[PDB]
């Protein structure tokens, strides 16, 4: 299970987007016993929060998930080759760290509830 | 995250069906440490039970989910405007509380396993 963990952290973003299961499988597992239980419970809560974020974006059971949210060049004006063939996910996260919540709020409530209401109203037809 | 929590509890059911993410994001987080750990673990188990109920209805990753279960007028004979533009979800829950398990058993086993077997047998074709 642990084999290959984080091994594409120095690879390009595209090369590292082909090992997502390796890092997804490694996210789940006296006074010492309660400290370790608190660590395990926090890991569980953290996994559940991430999966809830995926589920409120229409991205459940998906390691790669496309959306209807346009990319803003204000967030990043780099070209596709620069990002996917000339950058790592760590550098990317450093670059977009101050824009993450804007994207997460454009995915959270606008796109998904709009799309979901439209599917309900199309299912009416 | 907490902003807007339960703020549509006095709004109509339709107006309150547009803020579901606000209440979905607020469902996940010595001797005192074990009491609080038990509270956190029970919150996790409760969220998992709700998500399991959604998943056995074909409603995973969905805040609004349509089904193939007809509404019975015995459960409620009210008109759509009464329910969605003239009632709150609290009053609704008060009205249907003694019919919830019938609906949940018509969603649990009939609709979903029937539909799922039919998708398997159509995938055979």
């Amino acid at each position: 299970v642990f084999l290959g963990f984080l091994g594409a952290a120095g690879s390009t973003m595209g090369a590292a987007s082909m090992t997502l299961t390796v890092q997804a499988r490694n996210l789940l597992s006296t006074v010492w016993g309660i400290k370790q239980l608190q660590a395990r419970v926090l890991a569980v809560e953290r996994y559940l929060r991430d999966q809830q974020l995926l589920g409120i974006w229409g991205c459940s059971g998906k390691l790669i998930c496309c959306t209807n949210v346009p990319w803003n060049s204000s967030w990043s004006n780099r070209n596709l080759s620069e990002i996917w063939d000339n950058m790592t996910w760590l550098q990317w996260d450093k670059e977009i760290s101050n824009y993450t919540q804007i994207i997460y709020g454009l995915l959270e409530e606008s796109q998904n509830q709009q799309e979901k209401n439209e599917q309900d109203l199309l299912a009416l037809d | 995250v907490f902003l807007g929590f339960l703020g549509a509890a006095g709004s109509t059911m339709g107006a309150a069906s547009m803020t579901l993410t606000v209440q979905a994001r607020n469902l996940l987080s010595t001797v005192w440490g074990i009491k609080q750990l038990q509270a956190r673990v029970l919150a996790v188990e409760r969220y998992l039970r709700d998500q399991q109920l959604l998943g056995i209805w074909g409603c995973s990753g969905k805040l609004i989910c349509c089904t193939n279960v007809p509404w019975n007028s015995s459960w409620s004979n009210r008109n759509l405007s009464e329910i969605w533009d003239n009632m709150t979800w609290l009053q609704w829950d008060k009205e249907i509380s003694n019919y919830t398990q019938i609906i949940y058993g018509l969603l649990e086993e009939s609709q979903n396993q029937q539909e799922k077997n039919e998708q398997d047998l159509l995938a055979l074709d």
Partner: antibody
Amino acid sequence: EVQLVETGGGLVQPGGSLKLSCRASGYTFSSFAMSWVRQAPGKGLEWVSLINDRGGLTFYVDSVKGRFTISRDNSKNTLSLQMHSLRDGDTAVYYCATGGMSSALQSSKYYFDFWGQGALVTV
Amino acid sequence: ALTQPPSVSGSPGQSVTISCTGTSSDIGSYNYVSWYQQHPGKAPKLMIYDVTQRPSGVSDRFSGSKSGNTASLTISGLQADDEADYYCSAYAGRQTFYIFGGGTRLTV
């Protein structure tokens, strides 16, 4: 009380671009679907386009799918129809109408209850 | 599209029955058949919806019915104002939405 007023009719040349519009007053514009229905001068009615209450479900008749575009602004209480590449069969008086579909939280509205004055497009 | 009689002739005080027969996918599949009255020179008005349902502000003289794949509008007690062009519409599905029939002149 309900009044729909169409504007933007005119004389266009085959292949031109026009933008019809309809104004509404007397009701909650954001809680009804809106449709465009055309009557050619010598023939009967024909349904052209449909838009939902919110404005994100758009339906078109087979003829005009790629050419016509329906849109609505629920703050200005205005419905619009962009018609590109107008051919010769598109000459008719266009009516903006209320109805055609509804939300899941309302009853079925498979009909047009309120119509407009009319706007003649000759092309 | 649907087929409607080109003209229907009536005399004051008696009844008249316009018809609209369609295929099995529009009228025989969906109970959503509407009738509209367009006076000469003005815009259409809703007379009947949902086969048998009547909008508020419309007299009981206008009545609707359906049998199989055929819909019928019956106007009792014909008056001068009844003279108009009458069109039947049916909801045909979510791919093709609304199909209209040709007009019908009523002469009283």
